[PDB]
């Protein structure tokens, strides 16, 4: 109407356990990356394509509201429940879910947050190729895609 | 087929081929080389209140292949855009004989109390994000 008028460029994925939908760029602030140069590296290893920029450019505006890494750990745990008014307890819950609950197959250790950040970037870039015009849709009845 | 042009819901997004945001300080002396003599020869337009308008230019491009498929003119587009948002919206275009169909839009500044007259630390609408709302509202809500 008169605010942003660009809601179609949003993503707001549905993370496990989570009540409502939260953006995916907020998770990158909690993984130890507070710069747009590093986050863009996780998505694609070759940012020399101007066509792939118009899709990720509106999504970068949602990251300027949270710059500190400690703040991103509080926004995730605040939407799960409400443990009173203590913001310290909401940080420990976001630490175990990010490692043991979110993507358990890549590793559940503490030093696995560096390896886990690169795995999430490939999942986002693959969905954007089929949502723009460079990739087809995956078939569900494909026996090779099932076990 | 002449009635088909009036009955078919021709969306404005399909008509527009390209849209870019430019920085044009002097409206009479634009920076675009291919569209320089078009905005300069037009002098009958009352250019008295265009010195304190929005410097950010939102130039759109109209597809010519779509004009020959739906049978449309250039005089029926400018008369509809100004009748949708309101009178506080300038519109200008060129003839369909150059190299491409362009259309420049501006604002109608009253030049009276539209410059921190009452201060009010709230900020009505920033000039950088003002063109993004109209660019995404005309390509969907407005229908020819």
């Amino acid at each position: 109407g008169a605010k942003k008028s660009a809601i179609g460029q949003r993503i707001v994925a549905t993370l496990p356990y989570i009540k409502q939908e939260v953006p995916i760029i907020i998770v990158f602030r909690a993984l130890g990356f507070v710069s747009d140069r590093d986050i863009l590296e996780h998505i694609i290893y070759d940012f020399e394509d101007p066509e792939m920029m118009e899709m990720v450019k509106p999504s970068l505006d949602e990251a300027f509201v949270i710059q500190e890494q400690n703040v991103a750990l509080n926004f995730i745990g605040s939407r799960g429940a409400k443990p009173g008014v203590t913001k310290e307890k909401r940080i420990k819950y976001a630490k175990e879910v990010l490692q043991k609950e979110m993507l358990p197959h890549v590793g559940v250790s503490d030093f696995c947050e560096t390896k886990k950040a690169y795995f999430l970037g490939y999942m986002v870039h693959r969905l954007l190729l089929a949502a723009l015009g460079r990739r087809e849709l995956d078939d569900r009845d494909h026996y090779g895609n099932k076990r | 087929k002449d009635i088909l042009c009036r009955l078919e819901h021709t969306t404005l997004r399909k008509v527009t081929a390209n849209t870019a945001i430019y920085y044009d300080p002097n409206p009479q002396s634009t920076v675009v080389a291919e569209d320089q003599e078009w905005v300069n020869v037009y002098y009958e337009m009352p250019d008295f209140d265009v010195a304190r308008i929005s410097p950010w230019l939102l130039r759109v491009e109209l597809d010519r292949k779509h004009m020959t498929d739906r049978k449309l003119t250039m005089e029926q587009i400018a008369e509809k855009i100004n009748a949708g948002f309101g009178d506080d919206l300038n519109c200008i275009f060129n003839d369909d004989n150059a190299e491409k169909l362009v259309l420049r839009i501006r604002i109608m500044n009253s030049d009276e109390n539209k410059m921190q007259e009452e201060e009010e630390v709230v900020d009505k609408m920033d000039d950088d994000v003002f063109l993004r709302c109209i660019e995404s509202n005309m390509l969907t809500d407005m229908t020819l």
């Binding site: 605010k3 509201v65 | 900020d123 920033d126």
Partner: peptide
């Protein structure tokens, strides 16, 4: 101030950063 300014920022998103540092 991360829990008091975030709820009001997402509601309208019509503000500037110059008005936040000046108050602090």
């Amino acid at each position: 101030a991360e829990e008091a300014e975030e709820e009001w920022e997402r509601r309208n998103k019509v503000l500037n950063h110059f008005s936040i540092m000046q108050q602090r």
